[PDB]
Amino acid sequence: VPVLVMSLLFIASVFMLHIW
Amino acid sequence: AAFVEPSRQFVKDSIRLVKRCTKPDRKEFQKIAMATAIGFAIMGFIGFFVKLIHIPINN
């Protein structure tokens, strides 16, 4: 369950990283 | 000069393996055909639909 939080954060991070 | 024993032995023994094996017949065939297909469909529909998801997202 905590991995899902980490997995959700990572894909959101790269999407922000890609858009930045 | 016919000293090549194992090549004939391998064929003479591989046939033995396939003849005391059980061949999946009709009733067994469908039991496994769908299971491969559903497993194919599970990764071939959920995965495929997900593939279409990001095509406009990264655009």
Residues B11 and B4: beta-carbon distance below 8 Å: no
Ordered by start, the domain boundaries in chain B are 24-59
| Distances, alpha carbon A9 to alpha carbons A19, B40, B41, in Å | 15, 30, 29
Q: State the distance between the two ends of chain B, measured CA to CA, in whole angstroms.
A: 71
Q: What is the Cα–Cα distance from B59 to B55, expressed in whole angstroms? A: 7
Give chain B's radius of gyration (CA, Å). Answer: 23
